[PDB]
Design a protein around this nucleic acid. Structure first.
Length: 125
RNA sequence: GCCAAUGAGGCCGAGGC
């Protein structure tokens, strides 16, 4: 397939699993926003922990505006390979091009939310 | 069943039938 270079950073097989797993969990803690639109707002509103996007979005440009807003807001972001997998991670029978894990005070997901973020840093070496 | 976060359908935010 040859993953679009514009899709950086890209979660490796392992990190994707965890990524997808936290995504599903946040879903239950009512701490997950799906869709580029909603994702973007979470950023502008400053309530986003990190953003996950799908390298197989088509055309990728549909979301390429997100990393910039992320850089401008200092919110870590990552790309997973499939919008389907991300889809079912969000509990959606449809593909999800991007989602944003929200900031909830007191959430127990914190130790985990921090572990992805940190994982994400390491990706930027 | 079908449509649907590449946006339900009444900015909000995962439902419609």
């Amino acid at each position: 397939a040859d993953v679009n270079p514009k899709a950086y950073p890209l979660a490796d097989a392992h990190l994707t699993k965890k990524l997808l797993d936290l995504v599903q969990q946040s879903c239950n803690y009512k701490q997950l926003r799906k869709g580029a639109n909603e994702a973007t707002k979470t950023l502008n509103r400053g309530i986003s922990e990190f953003i996950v996007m799908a390298a197989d979005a088509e055309p990728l440009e549909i979301i390429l505006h997100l990393p910039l807003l992320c850089e401008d807001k200092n919110v870590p972001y990552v790309f997973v390979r499939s919008k389907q997998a991300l889809g079912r991670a969000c509990g959606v029978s449809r593909p999800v091009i991007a989602c944003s894990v929200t900031i909830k005070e007191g959430s127990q997901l914190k130790q985990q939310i921090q572990s992805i973020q940190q994982s994400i840093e390491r990706l930027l070496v």
